[PDB]
Structure 1
Amino acid sequence: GSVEKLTADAELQRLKNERHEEAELERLKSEAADHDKKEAERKALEDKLADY
Structure 2
Amino acid sequence: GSAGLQEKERELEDLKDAELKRLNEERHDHDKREAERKALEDKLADKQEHLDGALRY
TM-score of Structure 1 vs Structure 2, range by shorter chain: 0.3 to 0.5
Q: Whose helix fraction is larger, Structure 1's or Structure 2's?
A: 1
TM-score, normalised via structure 2 length: 0.36
Compute the TM-score of the two structures, normalised by the length of structure 1.
Answer: 0.38
Rg (Cα) greater in structure: 2
Q: Higher RCO, 1 or 2 (CA under 8 Å, sep at least 6)? A: 1
